[PDB]
Design a protein around this ligand. Structure first.
Ligand SMILES: NC(=O)c1ccc[n+]([C@@H]2O[C@H](COP(=O)([O-])OP(=O)(O)OC[C@H]3O[C@@H](n4cnc5c(N)ncnc54)[C@H](OP(=O)(O)O)[C@@H]3O)[C@@H](O)[C@H]2O)c1
Ligand SMILES: NC(=O)c1ccc[n+]([C@@H]2O[C@H](COP(=O)([O-])OP(=O)(O)OC[C@H]3O[C@@H](n4cnc5c(N)ncnc54)[C@H](OP(=O)(O)O)[C@@H]3O)[C@@H](O)[C@H]2O)c1
Lengths: 426, 425
């Protein structure tokens, strides 16, 4: 009714979870669009043999396992007609501009809402800048994807596993006092996530967890050395050095970037967040023994030294899951044993980067270019961008430009940042 | 210059020391071990031809050797005045008892007494028990310099050394002392560096256990594991909830280090930089985790930074950062040292492990001593109270008749008073 017929744009891990939540609520017709490729070919094959979307919850999340039917799947936008009231962008956030430009808007006049499932600062404005003149669609920004979900087996592209669910995410809208926010609150509540509506898109985008966490940890020297490796151990994303990238220097980068992003938010009329309380209360907690409530609530007024200490403790306390059951010797589950994905050759033989860190870099590069329009230099952010750029440049030097996909090459974020700022000022 | 050497307490430490003494060059080698089952096994083994046998493990294979024991005694009254050097290889809590038990009025030939694991005040305590004319020099070693155990008690004189420390410290009751240089060389044969210091208390203040075992293993988490009989033992060097290390425990560590450092200053000893001591004398971490400038600057950093650095140090050593990585990139889990827990002895009585019994006894003495220097040591006293309350509840539950008397309350004030009187003399 407020959702009508819903078109999922991108049909990967996020889309399958979102589809299960939409089918619980009642989506009218549910369709999906995914650009041509091996995945789309596999999806069409599975749907044609009668398959449905399948979502399995892992461990304590087993309760939300379910199946969802898809009414239509398109890998060719030419077949789309004006049948859709809601678009849900489940593609990577670094592709939002391309994907919105490529939609056949001449056949989508009935679209009333467009939801960005993993927004970042400026994404709402960027998407609006790409919409056709007079477009009626309200654009909604969800702060972060609300779970951890993976397609287990790429040969069963319609089956996903959700292994964590966040406690709270945030939702803003390009329409003031938007009623679609409540609809989406209900949709995500079905999986146990609390959606907090905020007054502007940028306030919600300022609560994108990966911008704060992936930037300092996965744009630094250790992560890049693992990711750009073909031999040797991949290491682990959330372990301490030398098993993973977390060091006191990375934590200092995290604090300083949070300060920079907070000032940008204030210049865009959004209230910044308390980083420690956000991580602990909205994403995943630790015991009071490790992070006392008074320290969590007081974090924004603590000194820089105390802030870095608390952030380090937070990540050290989650090397194992402190709430998991202990085994016979007293060990808890190794929560930080997610390995780094590394560079790999595509079907044209060209090196490609994994989404961590390519998407992380592209998001932060756009944010820095936007912040320039607000006379903010963002030196810590620029240091992280430079670390990535230098590491990827050395990789190209060693492997040969001939062997590298052009996504590894230098980009220019200034045009998109200019479009965002113009939309802002309009 | 060593002359004839009597090893008091013929256990693991003594067997390592005996072989180091023989490598250097000494006279007759004797031992005194108090009556008990171990002494009975030693006496039978010696009767059947046994000798002291040291095995070095792995890279320390070259420490392996045999040494004959020339004399074995159980009764201190049976000692002849034939000994120039005594080495105390018993638990440090027994040093006073051992010294009080020796017939010093007919041991005028003793020139040197070495305390292998000297706590703060041990040198003074030992000297307070000596007769007025006694001219023995007392040496304090900061800690035992290896890791050594008797493999099997059925072969009671055969010990295994698995590791040797980088560095220990040695002080003497005699200013600018020469037995001091001899023992520097003796112990150096094991590969340890002995650093001579100008007073005994300077060496006594450089034992890692005083600074680390007190905050970590006298707290609530450690005591709950140690006093448990069922459930997992947990791990001594892991973070909560797998082990006792918390920001609160690290704050206790910093505060206790400050208290101990001021006591050392009032006793005329230069205190230590805790983080530099841990990194350089116990086990290092990479510059990425603890920059050298942060290590060297630790003593002048603010309290908040000091706690952060200490927390990082222990988090960084949850795995061994210098071990070889496996195929995924994991390093060896050397923090998974299980807690030893209460055990019933031969008579059926509950006993505490040496960690934390020995650590509590040492800190109880230190606090009583510090009172004479007008130092209240509130952090130390909080750790003492934590132990006392937990052990008292254990006795309540199990029954005093089921508990070894070493669990019952102690009073360290008499020893502290003897130390302070000796220091003032
Ligand atoms: N999954 C999580 O737990 C999680 C957590 C945090 C954040 N997120 C964010 O959510 C977003 C989607 O994640 P996901 O795991 O669902 O990714 P996914 O499983 O890889 O699915 C992405 C979908 O979009 C298509 N796609 C990828 N790049 C595209 C492009 N440039 N243009 C058009 N379509 C494209 C993909 O098809 P092809 O493969 O054929 O290209 C695929 O169907 C990412 O930004 C992610 O960082 C996800
Ligand atoms: N071995 C190491 O690697 C190591 C490392 C660090 C610190 N230390 C400390 O150094 C001290 C000695 O260690 P250790 O491993 O050699 O202990 P150990 O193997 O138990 O040997 C102690 C020896 O001294 C005897 N003994 C105890 N009290 C005595 C007394 N009042 N008079 C005469 N003999 C006595 C013991 O006989 P009974 O068994 O019959 O009592 C035993 O033979 C201990 O407190 C230890 O905590 C040792």
């Amino acid at each position: 009714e407020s959702l009508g017929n819903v078109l999922l744009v991108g049909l990967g891990a996020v889309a399958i979870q979102v589809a299960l939540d939409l089918r619980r609520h009642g989506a009218g017709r549910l369709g999906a669009l995914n650009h041509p490729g091996r995945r789309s070919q596999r999806i069409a094959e599975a749907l044609a043999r009668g398959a449905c979307l399948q979502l399995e919850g892992q461990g304590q999340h087993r309760w939300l396992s379910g199946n969802a039917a898809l009414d239509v799947f398109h890998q060719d936008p030419a077949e789309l007609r004006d049948d859709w009231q809601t678009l849900v962008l489940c593609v990577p956030a670094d592709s939002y501009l391309d994907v919105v430009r490529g939609l056949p808007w001449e056949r989508l006049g009935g679209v009333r809402t467009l939801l960005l499932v993993s927004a970042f600062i400026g994404a709402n404005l960027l998407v609006r800048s790409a919409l056709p003149a007079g477009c009626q669609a309200t654009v909604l920004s969800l702060s972060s994807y609300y779970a951890a979900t993976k397609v287990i087996d790429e040969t069963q592209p319609l089956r996903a596993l959700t292994k964590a669910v966040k406690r709270r995410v945030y939702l803003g809208s390009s329409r003031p006092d938007c009623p679609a926010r409540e609809t989406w609150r209900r949709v995500l509540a079905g999986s146990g996530v609390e959606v907090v509506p905020l007054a502007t898109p940028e306030a919600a985008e300022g609560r994108n967890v990966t911008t704060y966490v992936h930037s300092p940890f996965f744009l630094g020297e250790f992560a890049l050395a693992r990711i750009l490796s073909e031999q040797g151990p991949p290491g682990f994303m959330y372990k301490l050095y030398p098993e993973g990238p977390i060091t006191p220097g990375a934590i200092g980068a995290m604090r300083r970037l949070w300060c920079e992003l907070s000032e940008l938010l204030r210049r865009m009329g959004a209230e910044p967040l308390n980083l420690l309380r956000f991580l602990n209360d909205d994403n995943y907690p630790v015991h009071e023994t490790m992070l006392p409530r008074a320290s969590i609530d007081g974090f924004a007024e603590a000194g820089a030294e105390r802030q870095e200490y608390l952030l380090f403790v937070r990540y050290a306390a989650l090397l194992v899951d402190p709430f998991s059951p202990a085994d016979e010797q007293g060990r808890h589950f190794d929560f930080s044993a997610v390995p780094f994905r590394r560079v790999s050759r595509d079907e044209d033989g060209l090196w490609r980067l994994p989404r961590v860190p390519l998407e992380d870099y592209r998001k932060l590069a756009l944010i820095v270019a936007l912040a320039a329009h607000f006379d903010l230099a963002m030196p810590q952010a620029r240091s992280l961008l430079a670390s990535y750029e230098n590491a990827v440049s050395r990789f190209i030097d060693c492997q040969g430009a001939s062997q590298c996909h052009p996504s590894l090459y230098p980009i220019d974020s200034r045009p998109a940042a200019d479009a965002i700022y113009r939309q802002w000022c309009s």
